Design a protein around this nucleic acid. Structure first.
Ligand SMILES: [Mn+2]
Ligand SMILES: [Mn+2]
Ligand SMILES: [Mn+2]
Ligand SMILES: [Mn+2]
Ligand SMILES: [Mn+2]
Ligand SMILES: [Mn+2]
Ligand SMILES: [Mn+2]
Ligand SMILES: [Mn+2]
Lengths: 115, 116
DNA sequence: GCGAGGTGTAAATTGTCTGACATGTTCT
DNA sequence: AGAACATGTCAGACAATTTACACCTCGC
C-alpha cells in the first residue's frame, strides 16, 4: 500500500521525496534544494544515509551517473507515497469552498510558473 | 511572525497534528483518534500531549479549556499559515507538468464532492 | 598533480518516544 | 462512590543527527 509507506517517514525524508517528485537529482543537488527549504546548511552525513534508507524501502532508485555521482529518482512506490500524503493533506485542508478556491489558486499559479 | 521560520523544522508527527487541526479544532483525544486512523496503529497520549504543548509554545496551536478536564486545541493564525506554506511547498514540487496538475485537480474535485 | 566534487561512514551527542504511574473531572 | 474520560509527566529505551575523518573521481 502507498499509505503504509508514506506514514513512518521522517519529515526530512518526505522532503527528500517531494524534491525528487519535482525531478530526479544527484545527491548534492538534493542537498542544495533542502538547504533552500530549511534555510540551514544540510549535513551530507545526514542526507546520504537517509537516501540509502529510502532505497531499502523501495521508494528511491539509486543509479550511477558518474563513478563519483549518483542519480536518485522516485520509484513508482515512492511516487505513490508522495501522492498519498498529498491526498491526505488535501482531504483535510479542503474543508469548505474557500479552502478549495485557495488550493485552486495555488495550483493555477504553479501551472503558470511552468513557463 | 512568519510560519515558515517556525514550521519547517517540525517533526512529521507535529506536521500531522497541524494538518488534523487544519480541518477543524478538536479536543485532545479526538486528535489522537484521527492520527491513529492515519497511522493505522495506536498513538500514545504521552506522545501526543507534549507535542501539542510544543506546538503551543511555538505559537502554532492555541489551547483553550472546554470543561475543566478537556482542552480544545486549534490553529493560531500562524499555525494556519504553517499548514498553507507546507501545502504550497509540496504543490510547487508536485505540479511539474499538466498531468501532475490535473491529478491534483481531480483530487480537489473529489474532496469538494465529499463535502456535498 | 592538485584542488574541488561526490559520496561513504560512524562515535558521540542530541532528539524523541515508550511505557508507564498519576491526578483531577464528568457521568450515572 | 465507581468508572470511564482527559490530560499531565518522565525515566528508561530508542531514534536521530552532528562532526568529524576518509576514499575515489572528474576538471584544469
Ligand atoms: Mn546551501
Ligand atoms: Mn556537507
Ligand atoms: Mn486551478
Ligand atoms: Mn518540513
Ligand atoms: Mn514529534
Ligand atoms: Mn493512550
Ligand atoms: Mn512551508
Ligand atoms: Mn506558492
Amino acid at each position: 500500500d502507498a499509505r503504509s509507506d508514506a506514514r513512518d517517514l521522517t519529515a526530512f525524508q518526505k522532503n527528500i521525496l517531494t524534491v525528487l517528485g519535482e525531478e530526479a537529482r544527484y545527491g548534492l543537488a538534493i542537498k542544495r534544494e533542502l538547504e533552500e527549504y530549511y534555510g540551514e546548511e544540510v549535513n551530507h552525513g545526514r542526507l546520504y544515509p537517509n537516501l540509502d534508507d529510502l532505497v531499502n524501502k523501495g521508494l528511491v532508485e539509486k543509479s550511477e551517473l558518474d563513478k563519483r555521482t549518483n542519480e536518485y529518482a522516485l520509484t513508482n512506490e515512492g511516487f505513490d507515497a508522495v501522492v498519498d500524503d498529498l491526498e491526505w493533506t488535501l482531504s483535510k485542508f479542503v474543508a469548505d469552498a474557500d479552502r478549495r478556491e485557495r488550493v485552486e489558486t495555488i495550483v493555477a499559479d504553479d501551472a503558470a510558473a511552468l513557463e
